[PDB]
């Protein structure tokens, strides 16, 4: 039972105060803009950061900052349950019930089915606009245990083509792949919005 902590959505001063409290607890803290396989993500708010989407895809704990404040005061890591994003749903919210519950939904669903991530058995080709990095999308996909097919790997068994501007590509270009095309937004929607 490890506590590998990352934080998302906090400004520098808030982050400094929370990391100071981690010195009262046995744990690991990873400073990176990237998702680095944290067991517990502390999120300022529901969002679509790399850390938040990747933690959802891997069924990790995504919790409020009160989890750190109360655990440090108690001198011991507490039960995560009441601190989870998804423990209680706001009926009046800019965020859908599905999005508000997404961290809990995936954590419980992956435990129920035994799957190691939300994208397990996916074999994905990314056609991301050449002017930008696909790196964050790749780390989210891999956190969900998708197999991201590199250009030098065989296209056998591709399940998804996730493409910049998937909705305007000609059928002739789509015909270069057996698998269907999905827009970039599908990744976020599958995790946060879709009713499975």
């Amino acid at each position: 039972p490890k506590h590998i902590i990352q934080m998302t959505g906090f400004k520098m001063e808030e982050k400094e105060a929370l990391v100071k409290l981690l010195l009262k607890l046995d744990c690991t803290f990873i400073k990176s803009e990237k998702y680095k396989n944290c067991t517990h993500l502390i999120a300022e708010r529901l969002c679509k950061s790399e850390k938040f989407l990747a933690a959802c895809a891997a069924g990790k704990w995504i919790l409020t900052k009160d989890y750190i404040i109360h655990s440090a005061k108690s001198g011991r890591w507490l039960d995560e349950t009441t601190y989870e994003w998804g423990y209680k749903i706001e009926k009046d919210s800019r965020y859908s019930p599905q999005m508000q519950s997404a961290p809990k939904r995936w954590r419980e669903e992956l435990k129920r089915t035994g799957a190691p991530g939300a994208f397990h058995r996916w074999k994905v080709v990314l056609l991301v606009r050449t002017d930008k990095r696909s790196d964050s999308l790749i780390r989210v996909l891999e956190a969900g245990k998708a197999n991201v097919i590199l250009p030098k790997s065989s296209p056998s068994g591709i399940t998804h083509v996730i493409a910049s501007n998937a909705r305007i590509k000609a059928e002739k270009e789509k015909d270069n792949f057996k698998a269907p095309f999905y827009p970039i937004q599908y990744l976020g929607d599958f995790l946060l919005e879709k009713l499975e």
Binding site: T8, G9, F10, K11, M12, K15, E33, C47, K48, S49, E50, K51, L53, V128, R129, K132, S136, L137, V140, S164, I184, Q185, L187, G188
Partner: peptide, 16 residues
């Protein structure tokens, strides 16, 4: 802060 500049919406970033 440059030391704390992670994106809060990596989907939105790819559409702009």
């Amino acid at each position: 802060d440059s030391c704390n500049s992670s994106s809060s919406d990596i989907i939105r970033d790819l559409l702009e």
